[PDB]
Symmetry: D2
Subunit: 347 residues, 4 copies
């Protein structure tokens, strides 16, 4: 039935050797599911984590990963709306307190008692993982789990960021980083949501990917000397919305400056040490809003998966073995990635 030993990728100090090795299988707590993870998307977040790019410390030794699509093989005595066999999703937000003002308003990700997969809780870069039963993602039977894996962070994230840009069907959204993990999903969520899509990315056939997945206007940051100008021109006065999913502080500076007056620039990506600076005068006069968006809630999860089920968004994924995570991380830190890598935990 349930083994005692499994394989994971784990590091013991920040930015230290990523070890592919045999580790213990974790036991569920009363609130938690034990999931046999079949695939895990790899999120740029997981790299920031390994590098120690963020002001919060990770749990060491840490098993990373937070886009885990697997099966429920065990559960706590306190878990309720779950059967053995159900498919489950391990997300960034392993678990919230579900008892504070924030969790009550559906801003579960902002709970100060938040427990995070691939940071403070052993994640989905292993064959077996634990996750809060209340927060976990109900994945419909029959879902190709390799394909859905990225909806679990990149998908819910950009979906919720779009809602928070307060667009309307027919308005322009500019996706900053349109070819990355988060970017190529945002592009589709946004087409599905009725927006006109402009994409800023750059690199080999990054454009091609963008066209193939429904985007309308592409601006290549490798070639366009005046990004702002192009956006302003392409959208006749600026993006009603901007979704910053680059890992560029620069790209973020620009997003403050090509967003439409009365528009909204959303911050999603979180580059090392990054500040968003904008001129006060300019932001006031133009009544521009700059909004931080942090993953999503359960309702965001249910909605975001519904888009995948209907077939309207689909990550451009390559499936490689878990034991190849050091390679994905090298590829990712060079922005070579066209969409998403998901790891098979069998290899």
């Amino acid at each position: 039935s349930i083994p005692e030993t499994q394989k994971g990728v784990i590091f013991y100090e920040s930015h230290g050797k990523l070890e592919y090795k045999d580790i213990p299988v974790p036991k569920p707590k009363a609130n938690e599911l034990l999931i046999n993870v079949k695939y895990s998307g790899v999120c740029h977040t997981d790299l920031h984590a390994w590098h120690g790019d963020w002001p919060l410390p990770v749990k060491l030794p840490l098993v990373g990963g937070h886009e885990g699509a697997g099966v429920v093989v065990g559960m706590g005595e306190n878990v309720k709306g779950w059967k053995i066999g159900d498919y489950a999703g391990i997300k960034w937000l392993n678990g919230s307190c579900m008892a504070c003002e924030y969790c009550e308003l559906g801003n579960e990700s902002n709970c100060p008692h938040a427990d995070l997969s691939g940071y403070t809780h052993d994640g989905s870069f292993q064959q077996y993982a634990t996750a809060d039963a209340v927060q976990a993602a109900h994945i419909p039977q029959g879902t190709d789990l390799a394909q859905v894996a990225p909806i679990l962070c990149a998908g819910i994230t950009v979906y919720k960021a779009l809602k928070s840009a307060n667009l309307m069907a027919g308005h322009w959204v500019a996706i900053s980083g349109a070819a990355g993990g988060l970017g190529s999903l945002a592009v589709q969520y946004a087409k599905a949501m009725g927006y006109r899509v402009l994409g800023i990315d750059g690199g080999e056939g990054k454009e091609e990917l963008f066209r193939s997945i429904g985007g309308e206007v592409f601006i290549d940051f490798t070639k366009e000397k005046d990004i702002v100008g192009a956006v302003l021109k392409a959208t006749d006065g600026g993006a009603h919305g901007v979704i910053n999913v680059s890992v560029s502080e620069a790209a973020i500076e620009a997003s403050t400056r090509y967003v439409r007056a009365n528009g909204t620039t959303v911050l999603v990506g979180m580059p090392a040490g990054a500040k968003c600076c904008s001129d006060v005068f300019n932001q006031v006069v133009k009544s521009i809003s700059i909004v931080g968006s942090y993953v999503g809630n359960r309702a965001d999860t249910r909605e975001a998966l519904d888009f995948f089920a209907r077939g309207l968004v689909k990550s451009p994924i390559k499936v490689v073995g878990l034991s190849t995570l050091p390679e994905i991380y090298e590829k990712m830190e060079k922005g070579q990635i066209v969409g998403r890598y998901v790891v098979d935990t069998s290899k």
Copy 2:
């Protein structure tokens, strides 16, 4: 009955001598009210107009003023909803194209063809002024035009800001510089809107004043030094809303750090150099929004006036002669202005 000559305050160069001289009485176009301004507010926005600072062309020869309280004394053929004897207010936004995206959404401020009182259009620093009938404030019968005049820029601006903060009755709002100028007004609207009010200011008896006008908690920048810590403590986790009257980089920056999760920190004035630098991490992790808020539209205005009608918002004013005006510009170009000054267009 309607004069031909009038007294007013006008210049011929950027930073030219300010001529309290006689000038022609303007004739209203078919779309305008002609207004006999009895009192006008004076703020620093008028200073920057004079100085020729801000980017785009002033209209020389210019009569300044954008806070005009008067009586409709004449009107064009096209005018509707206005009677001779109605009390009218001349705001920053005098008129707009009424035929663009921005205008239609009640964001006329952001019109490409915006006509600006005391800038592109001769303003309230004169006995008789013209104004697009459609934007002009409908001051209610039985409003003291001296006491109401400053409300036409500061009051409405501050009311719009509080809406831009997007709070509900019972949420804490934090107002920087809360006892000086825009602050006092802010505090009073906030209170009248059901918000719990935290004030930050410093100096001779400002705490007393702040209490006397509805302020709940006062944080003293002279005697406290972990502002963030004390705002957090007092509001049990941060301020749902912030209005940033004081515009030091540091005061704004701190807002991003004492603002509650999912809260909104609002940028207000027209400061000609200030930057807002938010840590991307912290802004994303706490789901914070930084909303630039400009001048109110016609609905903002009617609403801001209704609270003042109800006796709920008062400004201490100091009434001196229009003839005295240059003296007051001159005191503003240093900083010898103690308080909120209203000009009497008869003296």
Copy 3:
């Protein structure tokens, strides 16, 4: 160059003979466009005007029409944002006071002094008509004025209704009578807005049509009899939004019962007798809203036109001569109107 005499369609009594006779060309006031209407829509609202049904005074002698597509051929002095040669649209709401609570909130429809095309103001059933410049639609260059004309009442009404339904991309919307008239248009906007579309209609091949225009599920009133049950089943718990084109008491009433919890059921047309009876229990227990939705404001309009610009909303039209008009009123006063009729003001 601009004629003095013109042809138009005018009456002298409530339900009088409809004179296709020559009439003076109206002169625009300083606030108006003079428009050479090339095509006008014809709906039943024009029928009730003629008939003298609705409560308050028609303006005899009257030229009907409220769906006018033309070119700006002249303008008053006050007009802004308009050029000769611009294509313009004459809607139900022609002009308003622009100086009341209602006007300022973009709810001009509800103005006490609302000037209504083909009612209080001679409308689009004529070669040349005048219209308040501020409300007139800005039809984009490169729009076929025949195909666009009906969108000026039905299209916008139907677009506003869907907003009044307050749905998000991926929510089910249920549209009654979905293949006839307002329905087809509704369906197409809904689809273009990201909504999943359920249609209810009945009769000869309406299901086919409905599919051909984006409809997802079709519920056939001929062949099904637990409508509520089938709407519930198909939408897995009810329709987040309902647009009630068909106005039988029963069709509306049912809406309150197939609408999802927290959902919104929208009332649209101008039916001169219909009642909406909701069970208070059921409306309270399912937190249902019943929102009356009227004609779109200037922003509703610019948005509704932009979808049609993009090729996403088409109406089958049938173009017959303005001279032919009374025949069509006459067919409307019974119900011999097969489809959506547009008048050519040259023939």
Copy 4:
């Protein structure tokens, strides 16, 4: 410690004899708290329940009551954020599934698996009761429990109904039934929320109560022949909001007809067999919304109690013995009640 026997009021068939007798103390389930209830507000809902006024059946034999303010003396092994001694509130919504689309959106009351205090779950008309630990109301230590008891249904209910009327500080709200249990709280919530308050009730010193608790304009339905007229007059065109907490189908008819254009009428009260009927034309033309509101959620609970803690709302209560519930019910069915009766479970 915890007795095995206690006293309750219980009936065995609908509208049957209300028995004051010795009953078993209930055992908590894993999810639940066992509360020693000290006081229970009595809600008109509890009467509708005993009479069988509503289309859903009660649990028989039923212990009524759903505004229970007491102490936590025991709890399930699965309960988490609770200590023995905490004060707890039993509300209408004993418990939701907390796992469906609705519960996720914070519309917990609309869960189809909803378990209801004083209908499907033994309520607070007894010394000891069970209640879901996740839904239960955290009452701050030191709260006078007799006074807070009504916040638990009447308070959260009207608070949430006001939010759902979408008013702004300065708009008029008309409370229909301003002197009843729900009414006198709505009046205060609304003053606290910055609205102008108009009240419709009637009966001995019902006005007096209204004045004493902060209401501005009272219209007595015992004396005013034209209620609509008076409201229209009193608020200069109608209530931006209406909160129907009468138990009159009539009063509800009127509320559809004195609500401001663009305003919102909220249905809260649920008289036997009641329909809300409104003219379609009138509701469309005026873009009026009619919205059902069903108690509140946890966040509504936390907010609503915060208003009581700050001292801004206070039920006008008489405290009598539980054993006197047949008398309260007789008084209530004659609309003699000026505010609220709370039952002491010691007598």
